[PDB]
């Protein structure tokens, strides 16, 4: 069959964490802006910790299962789980949130070179994600979250395996997935970002559009777009997905973009903007 599967998962002590601030609530359970000090490490990783019913144990444990079977730079790092008469799982902090608020937040000091770097910075991610069998499956601007301006991540895949209007076509009809599939909500993910936030196909009823796509109509070209942009978001919309790129494409075509950022990206007044207890360090570094 398939490779044995070595992830280790760790289990960590509720004395060992604090929890500073809660992020959000809602029915899932809460999610805590806090604090983790290993034993005797003389480290501080700034985390985000969940915390929430037999069903929905399962849940969570599931999620750590993928969390912990996937780590890298650009997928967000699953510190650890502990065990608790309400199960927490311990992941890595993104200070400024999601992708999606932050670039309603900022549009107006957002470049083009910051746009194009986040482009190759999620799919270099997706590529990862291809490279481990790991179908995400909900791909979107909520779900990408910030380290930094200059750095982005994808996370909360609690769909992920192995949201009607991210989905590629096959998705809607057949309840298909694959890579490809993710392509297409990649493109939906880029459309989000050039619009700076812009809801796809607002005002549309979503048992319209399964339709609409047979049609061939497909989200409109954005201002900041040139035709060279805006020619890859519909590649990934094909309907033969065979024919859409792959993620690796995606990364050498945006990485050549990002090189000319002006050339590619038309913003407005572009190149005036600019971007915004010892020890502490970032989970990225603690674990090699
Ligand atoms: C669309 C994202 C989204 O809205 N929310 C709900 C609340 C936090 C949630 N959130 C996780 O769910 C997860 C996560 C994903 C999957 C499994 C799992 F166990 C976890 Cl823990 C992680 C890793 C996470 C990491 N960093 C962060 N920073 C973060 C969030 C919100 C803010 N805001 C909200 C309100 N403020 C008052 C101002 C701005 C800020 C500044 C930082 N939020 C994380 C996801």
């Known amino acids: 069959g398939e490779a044995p599967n070595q992830a280790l998962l760790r289990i960590l002590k509720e004395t060992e964490f604090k929890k500073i601030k809660v992020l959000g609530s809602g029915a899932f359970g809460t999610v805590y802006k806090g604090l983790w000090i290993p034993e005797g490490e003389k480290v501080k990783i700034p985390v985000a910790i969940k915390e929430l019913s037999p069903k929905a144990n399962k849940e969570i444990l599931d999620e750590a299962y993928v969390m912990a079977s996937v780590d890298n730079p650009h997928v967000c790092r699953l510190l650890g789980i502990c065990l608790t008469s309400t199960v927490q799982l311990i992941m890595q902090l993104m200070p400024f949130g999601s992708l999606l608020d ?28 291809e490279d481990r069998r790991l179908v995400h499956r ?15 991540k994808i996370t909360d895949f609690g769909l992920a395996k192995l949201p009607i209007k991210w989905m ?28 700076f936030g812009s809801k796809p196909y607002d005002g549309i009823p979503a048992s319209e559009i399964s339709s609409i796509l047979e049609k061939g109509e497909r989200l409109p070209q ?46 407005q007044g572009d190149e005036r903007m600019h971007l915004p207890m010892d020890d502490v360090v970032d989970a990225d570094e603690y674990l090699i």
């Open 138 to 152: 909900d791909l979107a601007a909520r779900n990408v979250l910030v380290k930094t301006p200059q750095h982005v």
């Open 222 to 267: 954005p201002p900041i777009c040139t035709i060279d942009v805006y020619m890859i978001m519909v590649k990934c919309w094909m309907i033969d997905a065979d024919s859409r790129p792959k993620f690796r494409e995606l990364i050498i075509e945006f990485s050549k973009m990002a090189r000319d950022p002006q050339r590619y990206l038309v913003i």
């Open 168 to 195: 590629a076509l096959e998705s809607i009809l057949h309840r298909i997935y694959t890579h490809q599939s993710d392509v297409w909500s990649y493109g939906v993910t880029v459309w989000e970002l050039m619009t």
């Open 102 to 129: 932050y670039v309603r937040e900022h549009k107006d000091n957002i470049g083009s070179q910051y746009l194009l770097n986040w482009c190759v910075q999620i799919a270099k991610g997706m590529n990862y994600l």
